Structure formats: C-alpha cells, structure tokens
Amino acid sequence: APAAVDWRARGAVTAVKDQGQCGSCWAFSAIGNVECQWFLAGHPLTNLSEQMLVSCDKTDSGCSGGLMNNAFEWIVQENNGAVYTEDSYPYASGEGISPPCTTSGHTVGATITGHVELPQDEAQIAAWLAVNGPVAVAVDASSWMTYTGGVMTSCVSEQLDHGVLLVGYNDSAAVPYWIIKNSWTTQWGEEGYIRIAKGSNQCLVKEEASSAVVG
Template identity: 70%
Template sequence: MKVTHTLVSLAALAIILCTIPAAMASMRADDTLASKFAAFKQKYGKVYRDAGEEAYRLRVFKENLAHAELEAKANPHAMFGVTRFSDLTREEFRQRYINGEAYFKMAERRLRRPVEVPAGNAPAQVDWRTKGAVTPVKDQGSCGSCWAFSAIGNIESQWHMAGNPLTRLSEQLLVSCDTVDEGCNGGLMDNAFKWLVDSNKGKVYTESSYPYVSGSGQTPACSTSEHEVGATVTGFVDLPKDEDKMAAWLATNGPIAIAVDANSFLSYVSGVLTNCESDQLNHGVLLVGYDDSSNPPYWIIKNSWGECVSF
C-alpha cells in the first residue's frame, strides 16, 4: 500500500510540474498579447468607450492575430499581422470597407460590350507611379466609397495622360451627388462614369474645391456651390475578362478601375497575395501596374485606405 501511495504521489507531482510551465507559457502569451494591443492602441490612437468595450476589442484583436497566421499560410509570399483594422470583427470590416459585393455581382449580370483590345506582347513590367501618372494614396475612411476613389483615380490618371497636369480630383462629388450610386453605402465605377457623362456634363471638380468629408461614414447633400472643374470626361469603356488583354491595355492606356476580393486585406501588411477568389469581388481599387518577370508575377494596385495600407 505504501508503494502504491508513493507512485500516486509521484504522479501527482509530475502533473503539477508539467502544468507549471504550461501556466507560465500562458501568462507570457497573455503578456505578449497585452503589449501588442497596447502598442496597437498607441499607434492608431484607439480609445474605447469603457473597460467592457476594451476587453471585447482585445478578444477581437486576439482572434484577428490568429486569423492572420492562417492567412500567412495560405499566402506564402505575403506578410500578415497587426493593422489599423485589427480590433474590428470581420463583419465590421466588411460593412465599413468592402461592402461592394452586391454591386459587383449586379455588374456581372449586365450586358457588357467590352472594347476590342489588339493582340500583342505587353512589356514584362509596367508601373505608372514611376511615370508620374498616379496621385498619392488617399483615405476613404469609414465610408463604403471605394467605388468613387477607384473611378476618380482612373480619371486623374487618364486626364494626365491626355497631356494635362496631374490633378487631384473630387471623390466627394460622386459620393454626394451621383444619384445612381449610394454614397457611403456603395456603388459602381461604371455607374459613376455614366453619371458624370450623362448628368454632370462630364465635369469633374478638383479636390481642393470640393474636398472629401465623408471619412466618418456620413454622406452630406450634394453641394450646389460653384466648384473648379479639374477634368472633363467624354466616355468610358469596359475591358474583356482576360488578364493578358488587361495587361496590354494597361501598358498602353494607363491605370484601370477594377474590383478585387479584399477579404484578406484586414491583416495584410506587405507582399504578394496569391490566395483570392475572382468570383467574390467586393472592393474597388485602381490597377496601376504589374510585374510579369517576378516569381510570383503580380499586379500593383492603388488602394484608398491611407498611406499605411497601400499595395
């Protein structure tokens, strides 16, 4: 009986000794998480309503870090981690920043007559940023206006390539005045181009005369004041669903307004995204270049989430 008791005691001791390192590892992980969250709050100026909300956002932050590890495994050529969106649930992120899925699905159902793109060998690399044809990255804020930034970015570049100075143009014009789209609740680039041509005489105002004010998610009424015309649009075309033809068009004609699957953007830091769904388009961006000589080859897009989240 004594021997049996001793074995039980040793077994209990082994369990205790094994659980102490595990507990210490858990404490270290909690400390690391807390320090990362504190650094995140400081960097992005995050202030929460009360302790309850802060605890909730910490849990969301932890979940997003875990999801970032999964994204990294699915995208071996990219880096994922803490971003300004790391305290948002995936649903909050979708509603605020990538809410265009319904619009892009609607666009897919429309009868399209893509422009003919001549066959030809496109150069291995193109980057319109290096040619001075792309304005600096802007920030749409907490407003689902990616469609407006994509459309205006395209017009800025096309206007410059037509021989005019590179001019920052007004997204607010589209967000507030375009009666076909829905401001911060989403829209389509094609709709925006058509509205400008059909309803605004092709006039696009300068950003300085009609600045962006919808970053908080509000869509103010259309301004009837006089604004400076910065560019004029006479028409637009749709391109074929063919990456080779898109590259050929881009190389010759400049940046293109496109839609992408941005579900992985919540935790994206840098690198080349290789895991995305072409049938889950939900975010409007500007295609400004590509590199077909790289391994892997990649497209270059201009996003509208500020300089800290450009691609």
C-alpha cells in the same frame, strides 16, 4: 506586351487617399482612374474629387456602395462630363455620412467623354493598361484586412465587394504580379498599395475592369 509597367514611375498616379468609415471605394476607384487618364491625355496631374461622386452621383449609393461604371456614366450624362478638383470639393465623408450635394462653389479639374469596359482576361487587361494607363477594377477584398505586405499569392476569390485601381504589373518577377492602389491610407499594405499574383484571377481581379475615356 512590355515585361513590366508601373505608371507611378511616369508620374501618372496621385498620392494614396483615405475613404475613412465610408463605403465609398467605388468613388476612389473611379476618380483614381480619371486622375491618371487626365494626366495621360496631356494635362498636369491633378487631384480630383471623390466627394463629388459620393454626394452628387444619385445613380450610386454614397457610403452604402456603388459601381465605377455607373459613376463614369453619371459624370458624362448628368454632370456635363465634369470632374471637380479635390481642393474645391474636399472629402468630408470619413465619418460615414455623406453631406448633401452642392452644385456650385467648385472648380472643374478634368472632363471625360465616356468609358470602356475591358475583357474579363488578365492578359488583355494588362495589354490595355500598358498603352492606355491605370484601370478601375473590382475585387474580392475579404483577405485584404490582414494584408501587411509582399506579393499575395493566395487570395479569397468568391464575391466582388471592393473597387480599386490597377497601376501596373511585373511579369519578369518570380511570381508575376499586379500593382494596386488602395484607398485605406498609407498605413495599410505597402504604403497604401497591394501586390497580388497575376495570371490566376486572384481576388477576381479580371471580372469588372473599366476605364474612363478623356477624348
């Protein structure tokens, strides 16, 4: 595979968002992945709605948690494959409470046909990402609260509890690393991003990788 890939360089990644006091990381991970896949399918980069999932995805638990795979399936099976634009369904869960789901007054910004679950292997995940784009992954974010920058070479890897987005990697660096987009504002980490060492399953990054498919 290529030595280094950074999808931000191809204009495929939207700006870092803010989940606030809501445990909606799974929604940001899922939507972030859809935003990138949609752009890669030949459409203009569009900000999509995490609120749609937090409020309407009943197979998940809003601010109490959820699974990116459940989110992908809900979109296809329950929402006719539709994903609203963020402007038409703004995020309003920053306080920790998800307002009721509204089935109208929104605009469809993207559509997906399904999703694939990637192998629990970093080399294989990197190969897929290099050609197909950003991947939604689950990680153990225990060590992430004190992250200020640089490549994290040691990460607590015990229990998956956070959903994020893999936007790239660099195998030619001193210590190969993954480039990850987080949803805790640009004030956290490296302008909202975090780089973790690649190759030793840091933060359990290879355990639950997946991506939406936009036919």
